[PDB]
Amino acid sequence: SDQVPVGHIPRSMTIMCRGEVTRMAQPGDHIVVSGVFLPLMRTGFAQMIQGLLSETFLQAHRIICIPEELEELAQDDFYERLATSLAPEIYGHLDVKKALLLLLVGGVDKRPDGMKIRGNINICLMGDPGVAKSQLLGYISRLAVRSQYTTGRGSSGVGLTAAVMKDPLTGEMTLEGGALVLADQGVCCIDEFDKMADQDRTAIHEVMEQQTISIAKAGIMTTLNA
Amino acid sequence: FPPERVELLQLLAKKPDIYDRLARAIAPSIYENDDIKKGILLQLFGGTKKKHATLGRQNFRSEIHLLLCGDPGTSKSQMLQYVFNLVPRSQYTSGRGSSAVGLTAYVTKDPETRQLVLQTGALVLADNGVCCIDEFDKMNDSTRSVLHEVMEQQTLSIAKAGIICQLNARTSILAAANPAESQWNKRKNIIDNVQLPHTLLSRFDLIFLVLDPQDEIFDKRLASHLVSLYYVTRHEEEDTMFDMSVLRDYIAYAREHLSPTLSDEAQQRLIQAYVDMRKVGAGRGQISAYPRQLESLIRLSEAHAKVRLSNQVELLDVEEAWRLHREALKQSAT
Amino acid sequence: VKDEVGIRAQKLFQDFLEEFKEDGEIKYTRPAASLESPDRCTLEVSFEDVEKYDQNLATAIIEEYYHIYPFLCQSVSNYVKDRIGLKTQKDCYVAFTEVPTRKVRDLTTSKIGTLIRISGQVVRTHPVHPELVSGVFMCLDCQTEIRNVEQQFKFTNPTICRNPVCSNRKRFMLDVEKSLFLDFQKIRIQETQAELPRGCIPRAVEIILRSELVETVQAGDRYDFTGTLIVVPDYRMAFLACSVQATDLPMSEVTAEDMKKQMTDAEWHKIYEMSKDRNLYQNLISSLFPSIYGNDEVKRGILLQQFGGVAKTTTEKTSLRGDINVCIVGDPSTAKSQFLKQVSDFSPRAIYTSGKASSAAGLTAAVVRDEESFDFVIEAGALMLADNGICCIDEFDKMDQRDQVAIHEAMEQQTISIARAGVRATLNARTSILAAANPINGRYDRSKSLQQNIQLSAPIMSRFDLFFILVDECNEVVDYAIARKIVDLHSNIEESVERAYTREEVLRYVTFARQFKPVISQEAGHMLVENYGHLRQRDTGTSWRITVRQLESMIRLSEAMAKLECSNRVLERHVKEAFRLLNKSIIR
DNA sequence: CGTTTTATTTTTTTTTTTAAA
Numbered sequence A: 001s002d003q004v005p006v007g008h009i010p011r012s013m014t015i016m017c018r019g020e021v022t023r024m025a026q027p028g029d030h031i032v033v034s035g036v037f038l039p040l041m042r043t044g045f046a047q048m049i050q051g052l053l054s055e056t057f058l059q060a061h062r063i064i065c066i067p068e069e070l071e072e073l074a075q076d077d078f079y080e081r082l083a084t085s086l087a088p089e090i091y092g093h094l095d096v097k098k099a100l101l102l103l104l105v106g107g108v109d110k111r112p113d114g115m116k117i118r119g120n121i122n123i124c125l126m127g128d129p130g131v132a133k134s135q136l137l138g139y140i141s142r143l144a145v146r147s148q149y150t151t152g153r154g155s156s157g158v159g160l161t162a163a164v165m166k167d168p169l170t171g172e173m174t175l176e177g178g179a180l181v182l183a184d185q186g187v188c189c190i191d192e193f194d195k196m197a198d199q200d201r202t203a204i205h206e207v208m209e210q211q212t213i214s215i216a217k218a219g220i221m222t223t224l225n226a
Numbered sequence B: 001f002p003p004e005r006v007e008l009l010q011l012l013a014k015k016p017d018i019y020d021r022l023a024r025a026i027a028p029s030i031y032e033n034d035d036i037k038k039g040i041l042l043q044l045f046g047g048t049k050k051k052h053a054t055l056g057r058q059n060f061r062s063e064i065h066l067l068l069c070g071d072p073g074t075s076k077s078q079m080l081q082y083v084f085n086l087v088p089r090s091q092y093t094s095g096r097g098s099s100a101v102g103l104t105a106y107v108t109k110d111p112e113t114r115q116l117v118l119q120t121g122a123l124v125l126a127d128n129g130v131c132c133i134d135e136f137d138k139m140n141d142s143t144r145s146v147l148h149e150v151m152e153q154q155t156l157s158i159a160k161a162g163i164i165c166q167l168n169a170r171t172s173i174l175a176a177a178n179p180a181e182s183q184w185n186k187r188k189n190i191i192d193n194v195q196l197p198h199t200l201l202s203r204f205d206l207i208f209l210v211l212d213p214q215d216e217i218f219d220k221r222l223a224s225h226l227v228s229l230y231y232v233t234r235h236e237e238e239d240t241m242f243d244m245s246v247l248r249d250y251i252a253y254a255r256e257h258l259s260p261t262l263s264d265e266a267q268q269r270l271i272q273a274y275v276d277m278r279k280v281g282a283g284r285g286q287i288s289a290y291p292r293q294l295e296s297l298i299r300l301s302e303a304h305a306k307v308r309l310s311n312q313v314e315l316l317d318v319e320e321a322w323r324l325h326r327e328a329l330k331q332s333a334t
Numbered sequence C: 001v002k003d004e005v006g007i008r009a010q011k012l013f014q015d016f017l018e019e020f021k022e023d024g025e026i027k028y029t030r031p032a033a034s035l036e037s038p039d040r041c042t043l044e045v046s047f048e049d050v051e052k053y054d055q056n057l058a059t060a061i062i063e064e065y066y067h068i069y070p071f072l073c074q075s076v077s078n079y080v081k082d083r084i085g086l087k088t089q090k091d092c093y094v095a096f097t098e099v100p101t102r103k104v105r106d107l108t109t110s111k112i113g114t115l116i117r118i119s120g121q122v123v124r125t126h127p128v129h130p131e132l133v134s135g136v137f138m139c140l141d142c143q144t145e146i147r148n149v150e151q152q153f154k155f156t157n158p159t160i161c162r163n164p165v166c167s168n169r170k171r172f173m174l175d176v177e178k179s180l181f182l183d184f185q186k187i188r189i190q191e192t193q194a195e196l197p198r199g200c201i202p203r204a205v206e207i208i209l210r211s212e213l214v215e216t217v218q219a220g221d222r223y224d225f226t227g228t229l230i231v232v233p234d235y236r237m238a239f240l241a242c243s244v245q246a247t248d249l250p251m252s253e254v255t256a257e258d259m260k261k262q263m264t265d266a267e268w269h270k271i272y273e274m275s276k277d278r279n280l281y282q283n284l285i286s287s288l289f290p291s292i293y294g295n296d297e298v299k300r301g302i303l304l305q306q307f308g309g310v311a312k313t314t315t316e317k318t319s320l321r322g323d324i325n326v327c328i329v330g331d332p333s334t335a336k337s338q339f340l341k342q343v344s345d346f347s348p349r350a351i352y353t354s355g356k357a358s359s360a361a362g363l364t365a366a367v368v369r370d371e372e373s374f375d376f377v378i379e380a381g382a383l384m385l386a387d388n389g390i391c392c393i394d395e396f397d398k399m400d401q402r403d404q405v406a407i408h409e410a411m412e413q414q415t416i417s418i419a420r421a422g423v424r425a426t427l428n429a430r431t432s433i434l435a436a437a438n439p440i441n442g443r444y445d446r447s448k449s450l451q452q453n454i455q456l457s458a459p460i461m462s463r464f465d466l467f468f469i470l471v472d473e474c475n476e477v478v479d480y481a482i483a484r485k486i487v488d489l490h491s492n493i494e495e496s497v498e499r500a501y502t503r504e505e506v507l508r509y510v511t512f513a514r515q516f517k518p519v520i521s522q523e524a525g526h527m528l529v530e531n532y533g534h535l536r537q538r539d540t541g542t543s544w545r546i547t548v549r550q551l552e553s554m555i556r557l558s559e560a561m562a563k564l565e566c567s568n569r570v571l572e573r574h575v576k577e578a579f580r581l582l583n584k585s586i587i588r
Numbered sequence D: 001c002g003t004t005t006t007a008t009t010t011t012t013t014t015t016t017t018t019a020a021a
């Protein structure tokens, strides 16, 4: 989606990796593959084929996706310099950044009474100055591995979470969870949550109590581990 | 079932500490308004029916349901999660995440020839189990008004163009009701607060309050206790003995071969005190009782008789109602 | 042959049915005598017979049923030939009964060939769709006569040869016309309501039946089926049966006396004490809901709803009708649904069901788009199963703005056509209805019009002729009758009011009144003009929308109350009491 | 030692969803 010219629409290919290399990538990993282009002798009917149809496909080798540091980590012993080299693009307003870098930090959790405790920090933000919330959002979403982004109306309540679909040509439909569903071990960053919708606060509020996305929609009380 | 350990079965019934002792067990770490663990008193030594073997009429089921009202992020999920993490019939729910009509088994497209079947409903598979519901004044009018009957009727008339019947299912209910507002607005008796009338807001026996003590006093306690739940690195086996399983079996015996009756003793109280129950009805912006909660009282009668050893009715039990009720029912000052 | 065991069970079969069976005489020849018209072939025999004389050799019979049933069908024919002027044209139909024995859960592979008894409901059904089951043909060559059994699902037109070695794929087309074939139907049926489990649903199962059993089934009944489970030679499962056991001969409070028919209402001798002594009405106010208390007007009024209406002898230009539109409201926590639920026990087609759930397609069927059977079967439904019945419903409140499309039809049109991708016909509403709305905060605050106290749709309150509300008050001595009645509500000894009129004698006497058809040249019937006039003197004050659609009530309520006397020839007094509570209807 | 193989499209009713002064 960074190459596709002004007058173009992205398209997909198929991946068939067999044998050992299975289970070697998740959805939405930006990955680079070295393999072969190979056509596909789709034999069967003698008139729907028989064109020399050649519906090609790909063969696999690898899924590369664009302590070792310990001696150099010995070279440096400092706490504050992260703010000094994280997001240089604005001078000052360190306090917001250090507040973020805490969420980058983590490390608070316990399972007493059998029950868990939310060990994730969730900041709220009001303001319209020129802040470049868009700046820090892009910065974090790039450096924070396993990142996400949504906007003020791009994802209604079903999209950011799981949802449902309709088609009388492929079978039944599933949940196909959204960015908020997918962003575990990380952050999904909404921009202008104030302006999305009032009832939209509901399902997100459900995930306030973490890892609980209840759905009595596909005949379940499913969880999804938000 | 085990005949071996009969000793302690009788031992725990005749011990008046039932009020709190097992209730003290349930929240393992939390005192969180432990008049709510006495509200957990409501709940187990299992729940007898006045089924109607004599006349056969009317199907008077002894159902139980209460809610845990909101306006503060209190443990109105955590208990419900403690339960669902313990009871197998385990589900968690809330408004705006799912449909009101999840009793459907949808035929979006099927592996059939459009022999449209609605195989099994979801929210009703809790056969005497529980579905936890949260954030209750969240949904539209159709949602949460549609259920105005199943609560004490357990029927679901499937009167659609498809296949038809009158089915059965009955279970337990609890949620985290919320008014239109975050905080209960002061100066203002409770019937004004939730947007339900003095028939539907004043419906149950009691739908129980959850406030903050307006001072630091209560605040630091469970902090001081359970700040160090990370840092305690141990658990104290006190005289409130953490019953590993010695609790979990007696309740299973609690329903088997003695059978609570109701004779002539413990019923004249609110036979007579229905005077006191209803004559507070002369008033608007105040509230009295209505004649489904007296049913909830005769249902309250069932539990305490066998345990404490008179399966015929004793009279004190109704006090538990007043111990419960007027805690927010004669709190009707104006 | 092994199955000669069952042929000897078939010897056994003959041995008692031709011999002395019961009553000093035959049981199974009047069937035989009757079958001769089309060669009807349908005959019922008791299964207790295989206990009376076979001496519990049912287990020599009851296993090999589809195995040896054919042979039992052979026995039927061998019976008939022994005395009837006969040629072997006689076919098969055997429809066993008398099996003290009664389910879906008690089913396996293992259950083939038995005669268990099961009951279900009527839904989701299919029509006559015959089968030219037998027939003749041969191979390419010559042998053109085959009276064989081509009926097993593995049947095929081309055969190999008869006299000489012929082809093996060739076929003739042959005598499908001077021969004997069958006819049958097919449905879906769901688990009974006498049996009802937790969790599970009355799942659906599917079955066929014979000519004399065919099209003799109606809405929700309790019959005794036959347990001949059979395979699909696709597999998947099916089942089959051959015997059913779903008011000239009298109802309860009798023994045989004479009437217009055999014992249709014969027991006047005992009815009539409870027919005329007009305080019997108080039994019908008191001895019918002794476990219940409310207003005493409903408990003196519903009965004529249950009982037939007008059914007069007049025009073709327009219909006249008997029953009435009806309602009941109040607010809950007043015991306003006990009664409806009880009717399902009290009265026939007292289909207590919710209205909250139903669709506008609740009533008829909606669609089919594949060859289910014929690609257009949209004549299934929910209402017209009222076989001389009523459909009272709960939760008429949040209901949609389409149901009225049927209720508009209620007391004038009563006809049933659909604007779908199928066809249009019509049907006869046999039915009245009940109303089940409710108010917002309940109390119908007496400062605004009762129409406006709910303010629902336009014509609804034109058609519904009586509403009969019970509204709440706070005078607790009212309330202290109740619990002091429920003093005997659990205390199991005579825990209600002493009765004076059993349910079954009530239910029987309902009929005696419905075959009298009064005749009204009543001069007081001519002075209804004065009744209605002084009524409208009361209507003049308190100034609802009133007309002759309410006069219809003025007519029917009193005339059908003269029916309720089990009487022709209307009596004026019925009008005045009818006047009385109805003089409340404007003041209501 | 010879003589033959193989395709379907639009509308319903439910449960989803979505619109204007």
Ligand SMILES: Nc1ncnc2c1ncn2[C@@H]1O[C@H](COP(=O)(O)OP(=O)(O)OP(=O)(O)O)[C@@H](O)[C@H]1O
Binding pocket: A089, A090, A091, A127, A128, A129, A130, A131, A132, A133, A134, A135
């Ligand atoms: N002190 C600063 N440091 C870095 N960038 C700045 C600074 N001041 C202004 N800018 C630039 O000005 C631009 C302001 O537009 P910007 O993207 O900030 O909108 P925004 O402030 O995010 O809008 P809103 O806050 O209403 O969502 C930013 O992209 C940012 O790069």
Ligand SMILES: Nc1ncnc2c1ncn2[C@@H]1O[C@H](COP(=O)(O)OP(=O)(O)OP(=O)(O)O)[C@@H](O)[C@H]1O
Binding pocket: A209, B030, B031, B032, B033, B069, B070, B071, B072, B073, B074, B075, B076, B077, B078, B134, B135, B176, B177, B178, B222
């Ligand atoms: N005395 C107490 N002991 C233990 N936990 C408490 C106490 N008081 C409050 N809490 C905590 O407060 C939290 C309240 O939020 P929870 O997620 O249940 O909110 P909620 O009940 O859904 O809120 P609302 O009903 O207002 O939407 C609980 O997780 C609980 O751990």
Ligand SMILES: Nc1ncnc2c1ncn2[C@@H]1O[C@H](COP(=O)(O)OP(=O)(O)OP(=O)(O)O)[C@@H](O)[C@H]1O
Binding pocket: B149, B291, B292, C291, C292, C293, C294, C295, C331, C332, C333, C334, C335, C336, C337, C338, C438, C482
């Ligand atoms: N006159 C009476 N006779 C018998 N029972 C009464 C009478 N008055 C009050 N009651 C009792 O009061 C209770 C009222 O609550 P109830 O279960 O009737 O709600 P409901 O009327 O079914 O609500 P809805 O009709 O809206 O569904 C009844 O169970 C009933 O037994």
